[PDB]
Amino acid sequence: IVNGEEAVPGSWPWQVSLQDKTGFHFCGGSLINENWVVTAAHCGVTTSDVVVAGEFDQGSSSEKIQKLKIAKVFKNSKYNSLTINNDITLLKLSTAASFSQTVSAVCLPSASDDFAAGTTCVTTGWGLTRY
Amino acid sequence: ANTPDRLQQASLPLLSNTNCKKYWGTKIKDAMICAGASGVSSCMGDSGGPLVCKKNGAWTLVGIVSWGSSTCSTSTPGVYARVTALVNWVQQTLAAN
C-alpha cells in the first residue's frame, strides 16, 4: 500500500499472508471462517503454498503465527484471464485455523447489499509502499 | 523496492462505476468495484487482501485487491473484485465442500 500507515498489531485479524514453501509472501487473503480463506484468482495459489494467519511483522522471527496447509484450491471457473473479471479464489485449509485475539473472520456481504459511492472503507496488506 | 515488514492500512473511498469508468473506460466489468484515487494505492503484494467497509458496525468484505495503475499511482482508481457479485458463488462453494 502506497501512502498508507502501519496498522495496530493484530487489529485486522482476518488478514492472512499467502506464502510459498520458503516463506516468500506473494499475496494477501481474508479468513471467512476457521476453514476457508478468500483471495484473488490471479494470485495462482496452489496446495504447495501456505496460509499464514496472525501475522503483523513479517521480519520478526519470534512473533507467534499459524502456518496453515491448504487442502484444496477453488478458483472461480468464470475468472477471465484476459479481462481479469471474476477475480476470486477460495482456499480450504487442511487444518482449521485456531481463532484468537489476533485471528478471526471478516463478514461477508449479501448479494443485494448496496455500499454507496463515497463510503470510507479500508484496505490492508504487505504490498509495496513505493513502486 | 521491497515490501514493508509490518502490516499496512489505508482508508479510501468507494467510487461509483461511472466515475471509475471516466479513467478505465470499458476495462471495468460487472464483478469489479473501484476505490481510491485519493492519495493512496494498493500495490504489488497487496493482491487478494481485503477492502472492508462497515455494515451495521461490523467489518464486511466489499472488495478483494485485484488490479490498477501499473505504477501504483495514488491518483487513479484501484480496482477490486466486487464481493457482492461473487458471494453467491462463495456460499455455494462452501455448501458443497
Binding site: V8, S11, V106 | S11, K55
Partner: peptide
C-alpha cells in the same frame, strides 16, 4: 465476524 478483538486505529 468482522469485530476485531484489538480495535484498529486509523488516521482517517
Amino acid at each position: 465476524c468482522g469485530v476485531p478483538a484489538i480495535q484498529p486505529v486509523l488516521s482517517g
